[PDB]
Design a protein around this ligand. Structure first.
Ligand code: NI
Length: 341
């Protein structure tokens, strides 16, 4: 059954609630982004309206084969009326096409649902600045102080310099980047840009990337592996066995692999700076785990909430254990007392 933290009180609306069959009383289903934990249940046989971003709507049509008549894309940063209710879609700073949703309830309550997001001070000058928010449905993925990680710009610097150095040393080295969903495309696009190459990939993944409205994308990606020295593979092939195998497939064009796994957080972050990251190495293969996050750090999170000053917070992640729920509630109380709302 649909859990409470996916329902919007006083509306006919749910968020990210496609795996529970027909939800009783739901007149419109919102989808925040195209990640399988959130779209779980959609398919070509879905017949209610779906509200979402343009990019999300491209993916639902082309990857899931949802019929066009049920896809309702909305522009970002624009006041729209859905089923008698005013709504705005905001950029989540998550993966391509990801949005937060502002809902203006007919009784005058205002609700923000962040979807998945990486809080940023730029959000403090969106349409959020212009009114009070009563309730916040918050992405609490990393809502603990041990979750620190660097900015995305720092991590991209590290990857660029790393890849440029190795390939300049050895023009016969191949770079591989692991992927399993949309998101984090900056990692492989940055690296291919510094090396003067296109990114090569499967037909399925090229198709997914053709849905995203990225500028000049025909110029950066390809399905011809032979012409590219940056390859993408499934995240599950990013290991010594998978990478030896792939290397054999390139027909002696290459004699070394430098591979990247963009992870969220890894406990190495409590001790080690980005400058100090080192690979796992076996033979002619090295593997780097890089902490490229598309979710808020604890501090980034805390700053957004203290700025927004909500009356009530409803977590949408780590809600399944009493120890989690307790821990989060304690931080929310700390933030409130420190700021004074
Ligand atoms: Ni996500």
């Amino acid at each position: 059954t649909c859990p409470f933290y996916k329902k919007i009180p006083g509306t006919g609306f749910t968020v990210d609630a496609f795996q529970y069959g027909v939800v009783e009383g739901c007149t419109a289903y919102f989808l925040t982004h195209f990640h399988s934990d959130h779209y779980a249940g959609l398919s070509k046989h879905f017949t209610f309206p779906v509200y979402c971003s343009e990019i999300t709507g491209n993916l639902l049509k082309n990857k899931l084969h949802v019929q066009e008549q049920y896809i309702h894309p909305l522009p970002l940063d624009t006041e729209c009326i859905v089923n008698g209710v005013k709504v705005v879609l905001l950029d989540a700073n998550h993966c391509p096409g990801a949005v937060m949703i502002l809902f203006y309830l007919p009784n005058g309550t205002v609700i923000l649902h962040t979807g998945d997001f990486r809080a940023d001070p730029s959000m403090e000058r969106s349409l959020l600045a212009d009114q009070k928010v009563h309730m916040l449905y918050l992405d609490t993925t990393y809502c603990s102080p041990e979750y620190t990680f660097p900015s995305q710009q720092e991590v991209i610097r590290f990857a660029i310099n790393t890849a440029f150095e190795a390939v300049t040393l050895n023009p016969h080295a191949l770079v591989v980047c692991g992927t399993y969903s949309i998101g984090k495309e900056k990692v492989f696009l940055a690296i291919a840009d510094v090396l003067g190459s296109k990114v090569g990939m499967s037909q399925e993944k090229y198709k997914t990337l053709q849905c995203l409205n990225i500028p000049e994308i025909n110029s950066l990606i390809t399905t011809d592996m032979c012409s590219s020295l940056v390859h993408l593979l499934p995240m599950m092939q990013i290991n010594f066995k998978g990478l030896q195998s792939h290397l054999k497939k390139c027909g002696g064009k290459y004699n070394q692999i430098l591979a990247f796994r963009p992870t969220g957080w890894t406990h190495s972050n409590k001790f080690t700076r980005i400058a100090d990251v080192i690979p796992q190495t076996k033979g002619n293969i090295s593997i780097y785990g890089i902490p490229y996050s598309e979710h808020s750090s604890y501090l980034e999170m805390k700053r957004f909430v203290q700025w927004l000053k909500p009356q009530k917070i409803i977590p949408t992640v780590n809600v399944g254990t009493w120890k989690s729920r307790s821990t989060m509630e304690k931080y929310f109380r700390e933030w409130k007392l420190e700021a004074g709302y």
